[PDB]
Ligand binder design. Structure first.
Ligand code: VLB
Ligand code: VLB
Ligand code: ATP
Ligand code: ATP
Ligand code: MG
Ligand code: MG
Length: 1159
């Protein structure tokens, strides 16, 4: 795939013409230098002696002409190329969505929905970035390179050879530097990936860590990793700065050598100095445009893969052509389905066969139904019924004709399908119903909604035919949604209607009306029903028993019952923070002996450019002086050597300039992370529960932060320093040497700087705000791709595609306008730069002709100002992006400055010696901070005495774990008092309490460490001797299990407990909890899924240690209730049953009912 631009042959006119324009623009610059060379000679000749006004004026005319030529050529290239890119991208996006909507259902099953959606959303943008702007830039760069070498050879015979001989050395050195930088970057990536794995492991189990209060250990480990992270980061920054310095040094060495040799030759009577100027400038500019081209080829290579994938999808041909119009289109469709030996297997799992052959004939006006055990395949049966799939081995026909023979669209349009969980499109209810059929009028909608028995629901909500189905728009009830879907199906005027789990839950009266309407449609429409309610099959015209992919039962309900088949058995069983640089300089603490050196080096570097202008103007002036003794040679030689120094110093300072800055930033990282992380732990778990603080989000903020803030502070300061130094020094020194020309160039500078920044951003940031419009239009794509099943079911694909086309045409013209605007901007910038030469040198000719200054002086001012503006633009655009960095810095400032309500880091809390162990919850009422309105506690109460075996029971999911979580003060209680030993719980030491108690989660978490260390992790603040760990393990009865394993406890835990089985993992967790010997123990489903003997051993250990050790127990096994000292049952946030197990059993009810159900 190298030629994938494959649309709008006429648009190819833009492709070539723009390219052509690029060529000339690329060639424009060396030509401009050519004349400049000759131009200089004129001055050098004229000063060596007058009619300079006319010659200067005609050269300025040449410059203006070439400038206008560029003003046309650059605009043409950029505009035309972006036009072609935009048009092709629009066409390919339309075709891509069209192809996706045409794919087969099984293909969607295999291919991830989110991957495909993000593919559409991002790869098209990648292709857009891979053509238009970048291609124009590449062609212009290559043209500039070629033309520069051509000019060098033509006007230069020996100097060009030496320059082009030096160039490959520069190329090799730069490539080596880039490779070294990439290697260092990858090594640092891995080095920090270590610490990042550690951070992920600690954060993902924040509940356990905060419960055990192991904050210190985790923080110490993270600091340990951060040390190596910082070391390698410092190495990387040093290497990057040294590479920059080496590039500078090589460039200035080339300058020195070229001017040395050219001065030698010209002193030897060779071509004039102007010839040297033109040849050197042109050759170097070409030999650096060659490298300037590379980003474009990188972008094109990137886009090649996206194009490959997208075209591979597009060219895919599906067997079930949902769009093919060649299929038969029967009209007199008498209701009749006939499946013969129908065998099927899901394409995702071809090995597993669901249907093992099936025969079934259903005649017109028949109510057929399917019944079977779990996995009976009824759902797959109906799916294959609508022709969504094809029969693996068998045949299916409608009205006596094979299903395949008929057109897929025609067959689909005559089949109503209602799933077990319909969802409506996020739009108006009228639109949702209209999606059933296009040619449907509001009267038809009224009739359908009346039939579905929902007119009251529609007329109750405001905007009957206008209520949207978006966020809070689609708040309709499940029954209301089912009614809406039924109405949609009815509006389809289908022949065959299939339904499954029609009206699960909710009032049956709505189910009654739904069934009545379905029966009324049954008068003429064949029906298939997958319903669990007995009444559904009570009047069913026929019921078929699908078990193990075999249809056995055949007959009415009475007939099947008389055979005592599975039907009878089933029936019986039924029975944007604000930031600021002043407030953001938190690194000054570790920056005082660093920022001073940084600013010093930056000042030196900035002044370096005006020094180069001084030397350049002096060298040129060494030949405009008429004295012309032999000393000129020496003079030139001397100046040449200065370049080398002007080069060498540049490297040295840079080596220091990075070392103070690169290190500084790195240092800041080692603080900021160690601060950020340190702040994260000292926080309330509620904050973690929020979706904003997802583990991935926290690790991204804690990892993709160093470079951000480092840039925002250090790089901003350094770039600003260098910019101000360079430009201010240039302006001042220009004013000293000449006034009028300095004023004119000062007037022109801002245009040059704007042009430089825009050119630098041309190849980087072409698509920034387009993503907004793309997302705005992509709601349709997300709808269709996510909900594709219903879309294909009711054949609404065409309307969705047309809607997408409109939504995409909304920004299409905007994209074309953006293309034209960018082209005009770039072209005007280039032309303004070219006119700068003409204006400045014409004014200089005027000045010199009146002895206002020496040509050396005007050249000095011109070079100083122009090159200063261009270099300041370049260095400003080379820095890492600031706005994103400032935003990230502000975000992390918010994170670090955040102070928790439960200051676990705070040591303020009553710490009485020992504890009585009486836990009292009175009118305890609280709700999750995520959903405070929904109550989790309803004034529940619980009184527990010292060493009292308390058991908690209730409906699964009632909020049992909520009480345990509150015991750790993870979430504050809205109402009621929680007291330990008759004391204010909140008034106690939060850390002291969290250490005193002990809790085993319903799903204990184990860190990747040695078993001994993991067990000892339970009790922090003091190393637990191996004897204590062994005793605890024996108490939990796992010591033998660990000793059996190789290396004993010394085994390294596999990822996610890979090495150890969950059964042993739960026992290990129990041992860890018991190690601390907590005053109060909390076990939540401690039995879980394990051997009953393991639960017996754990209970025996707890009972042995139970005395003087209060316990709270939750589980779904009744055995735990037998030995409970006291029992309690939670009911809707209120404890209903209180007392002993025997007393509760005698008072038959919730406890007795639960025991009977389970037992
Ligand atoms: C205003 C446009 C521009 O100036 C165009 C280039 C990139 N930037 C400016 C900064 C810049 C350039 N060179 C610098 C040296 C030190 C400090 C800064 C620079 C610029 C150049 O050569 O000067 C005219 C340049 C830079 C590069 C550059 C090209 C380039 O213009 C010639 N390449 C894209 C890379 C580079 O790694 C590469 O792979 O070349 C194919 C390249 O090495 C070479 C020459 O091979 C080089 C040169 C320093 C090596 C290591 C770091 N990478 C990052 C990008 C790359 C550079 C010029 C913006
Ligand atoms: C309309 C935007 C723009 O085209 C962007 C630049 C500046 N001007 C256009 C004219 C221009 C540029 N170069 C010219 C040479 C002679 C005459 C005119 C030019 C421009 C370029 O090279 O486009 C390919 C450019 C030029 C430079 C340029 C950047 C640049 O844009 C790519 N650099 C700022 C300097 C430069 O010397 C420097 O930054 O180091 C001190 C730079 O060398 C390095 C290390 O990049 C370089 C270009 C290779 C080298 C030798 C002479 N110095 C003086 C100015 C500087 C240049 C391009 C306006
Ligand atoms: N794309 C798929 N690929 C493979 N198996 C699938 C796929 N979709 C579903 N299955 C499973 O394959 C089996 C096919 O049975 P099917 O679900 O059609 O019948 P069912 O008894 O009506 O199902 P259910 O219990 O979901 O109501 C089920 O276990 C189903 O969960
Ligand atoms: N992060 C959370 N934020 C808010 N509510 C939550 C969160 N996690 C779970 N819940 C809700 O809290 C209740 C959890 O019940 P809890 O675990 O406390 O008791 P349980 O009887 O052991 O039940 P289960 O183990 O099924 O959750 C459920 O309502 C669940 O929806
Ligand atoms: Mg099913
Ligand atoms: Mg629970």
């Amino acid at each position: 795939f190298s030629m994938f631009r494959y649309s709008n042959w006429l648009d190819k006119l833009y492709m070539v013409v723009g390219t052509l324009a690029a060529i000339i623009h690329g060639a424009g610059l060396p030509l401009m230098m050519l004349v400049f060379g000759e131009m200089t000679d004129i001055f050098a000749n004229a000063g060596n002696l007058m009619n300079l006004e006319e010659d200067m004026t005609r050269y300025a005319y040449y410059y203006s002409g070439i400038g206008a030529g560029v003003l046309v050529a650059a605009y043409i290239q950029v505009s035309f190329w972006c036009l072609a890119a935009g048009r092709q991208i629009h066409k390919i996006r339309k075709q891509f969505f069209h192809a996706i909507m045409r794919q087969e259902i099984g293909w969607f099953d295999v291919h991830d929905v989110g991957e495909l959606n993000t593919r559409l959303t991002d790869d098209v943008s990648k292709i857009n970035e891979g053509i238009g702007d970048k291609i124009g830039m590449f062609f212009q760069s290559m043209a500039t390179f070629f033309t520069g070498f051509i000019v060098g050879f033509t006007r230069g015979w020996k100097l060009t050879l030496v320059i082009l001989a030096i160039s490959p050395v520069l190329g090799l050195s730069a490539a080596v530097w880039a490779k070294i930088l990439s290697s260092f970057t990858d090594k640092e990536l891995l080095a920090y990936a270590k610490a990042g794995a550690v951070a992920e492991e600690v954060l993902a189990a924040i509940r356990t860590v905060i419960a055990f209060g192991g904050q210190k250990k985790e923080l110490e480990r993270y600091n340990k990793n951060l040390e190596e992270a910082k070391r390698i980061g410092i190495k990387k920054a040093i290497t990057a700065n040294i590479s920059i310095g080496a590039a500078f040094l090589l460039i200035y060495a080339s300058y020195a050598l070229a001017f040395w040799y050219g001065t030698t030759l010209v002193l030897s009577g060779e071509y004039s100095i102007g010839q040297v100027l033109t040849v050197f400038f042109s050759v170097l500019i070409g030999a650096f445009s060659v490298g300037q081209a590379s980003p474009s080829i990188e972008a094109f290579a990137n886009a090649r893969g996206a194009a490959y994938e997208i075209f591979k999808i597009i060219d895919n041909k599906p067997s079930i052509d949902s769009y093919s119009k060649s299929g038969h289109k029967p009209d007199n469709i008498k209701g009749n389905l006939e499946f013969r030996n129908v065998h099927f297997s899901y394409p995702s799992r071809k090995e597993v066969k669901i249907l093992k052959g099936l025969n079934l004939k259903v005649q017109s006006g028949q109510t057929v139904a399917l019944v079977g055990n779990s996995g009976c395949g009824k759902s797959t049966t109906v799916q294959l019924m609508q022709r969504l799939y094809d029969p693996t081995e068998g045949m299916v026909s409608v009205d006596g004709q094979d299903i395949r023979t008929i057109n897929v669209r025609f067959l689909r349009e005559i089949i109503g399908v209602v799933s077990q969980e319909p969802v409506l499109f996020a739009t108006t209810i009228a639109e949702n119903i209209r999606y059933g059929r296009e040619n449907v009028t509001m009267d038809e909608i009224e009739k359908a909604v009346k039939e579905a028995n929902a007119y009251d629901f529609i007329m109750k909500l405001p905007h009957k035919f206008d209520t949207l189905v978006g966020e809070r728009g689609a708040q309709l009830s499940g029954g209301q949604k089912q009614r809406i879907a039924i109405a949609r199906a009815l509006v389809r005027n289908p022949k065959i209607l299939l339904l499954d789990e029609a009206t699960s839950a909710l009032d049956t009266e709505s189910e009654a009306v739904v069934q009545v309407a379905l029966d009324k449609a049954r008068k003429g429409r064949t029906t298939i029903v997958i319903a669990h309610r007995l009444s559904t099959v009570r009047n069913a015209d026929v019921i078929a028993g699908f078990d193990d992919g075999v249809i056995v039962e055949k007959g009415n309900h009475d007939e099947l019952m008389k055979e005592k088949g599975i039907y009878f058995k089933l029936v019986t069983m039924q029975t944007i923070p604000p930031v600021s640089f002043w407030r953001i300089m938190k690194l000054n603490l570790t920056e005082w002996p660093y920022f001073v050196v940084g600013v010093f080096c930056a000042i030196i570097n900035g002044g370096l450019q005006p020094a180069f202008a001084i030397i350049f103007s002096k060298i040129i002036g060494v030949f405009t002086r008429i004295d012309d003794p032999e000393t000129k040679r020496q003079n030139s030689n001397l100046f040449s050597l200065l370049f080398l120094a002007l080069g060498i110093i540049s490297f040295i300072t840079f080596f220091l300039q990075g070392f103070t800055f690169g290190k500084a930033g790195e240092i800041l990282t080692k603080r900021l992370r160690y601060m950020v992380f340190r702040s994260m732990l000292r926080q309330d778990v509620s904050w973690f529960d929020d979706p904003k603080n997802t583990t991935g989000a926290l690790t991204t903020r804690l990892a993709n932060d160093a470079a951000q803030v480092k840039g925002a502070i250090g790089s901003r300061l350094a770039v600003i320093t260098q910019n101000i130094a360079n430009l201010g020094t240039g302006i001042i020194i220009s004013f000293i040497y000449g006034w009028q020309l300095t004023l004119l160039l000062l007037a022109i500078v801002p245009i040059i700087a704007i042009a430089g920044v825009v050119e630098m951003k041309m190849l980087s940031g072409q698509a920034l705000k387009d993503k907004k419009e793309l997302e705005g239009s992509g709601k349709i794509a997300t709808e269709a791709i996510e909900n594709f099943r219903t879309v294909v079911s009711l054949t609404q694909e065409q309307k969705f595609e047309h809607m997408y086309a409109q939504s995409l045409q909304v920004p299409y013209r905007n994209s074309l306008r953006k293309a034209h605007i960018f082209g005009i901007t770039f072209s005007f910038t280039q032309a303004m730069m070219y006119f700068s030469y003409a204006g400045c040198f014409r004014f200089g000719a005027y000045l010199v002709a009146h002895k206002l200054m020496s040509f050396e002086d005007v050249l000095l001012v011109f070079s100083a100002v122009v090159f200063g503006a261009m270099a300041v633009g370049q260095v400003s655009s080379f820095a890492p992006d600031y706005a994103k960095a400032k935003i990230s810095a502000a975000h992390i400032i918010m994170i670090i400055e955040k102070t928790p309500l439960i200051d676990s880091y705070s040591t303020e809390g009553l710490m009485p010696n020992t504890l009585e162990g009486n836990v009292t919850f009175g009118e305890v009422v609280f709700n999750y901070p995520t959903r405070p309105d929904i109550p989790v506690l309803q004034g529940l109460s619980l009184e527990v005495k010292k060493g009292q075996t308390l058991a908690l029971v209730g409906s699964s999911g009632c909020g049992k774990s909520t009480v345990v979580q509150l015991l750790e003060r993870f979430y504050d209680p809205l109402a009621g008092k929680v007291l330990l030993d008759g004391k204010e719980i909140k008034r106690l030491n939060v850390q002291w309490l969290r250490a005193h108690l002990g809790i085993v989660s319903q799903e204990p978490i184990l860190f990747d460490c040695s078993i001994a260390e993991n067990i000892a992790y339970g009790d922090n603040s003091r190393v637990v001797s191996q004897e204590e760990i062994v005793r605890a393990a024996k108490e939990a009865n796992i010591h033998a299990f660990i000793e059996s394993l190789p290396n004993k406890y010394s085994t390294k835990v596999g990822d996610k407990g890979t090495q150890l089985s969950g059964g042993q993992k739960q026992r290990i967790a129990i041992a860890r909890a018991l190690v601390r010997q907590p005053h109060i123990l909390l076990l939540d489903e401690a039995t879980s899924a394990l051997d009953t003997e393991s639960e017996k051993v754990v209970q025996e250990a707890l009972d042995k240690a139970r005395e003087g050790r209060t316990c709270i127990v939750i589980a779904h096994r009744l055995s735990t209730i037998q030995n409970a000292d006291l029992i309690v049952v939670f009911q809707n946030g209120r404890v209903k049953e209180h007392g002993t197990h025997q007393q509760l059993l005698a008072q038959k009810g919730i406890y007795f009912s639960m025991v009977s159900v389970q037992a």
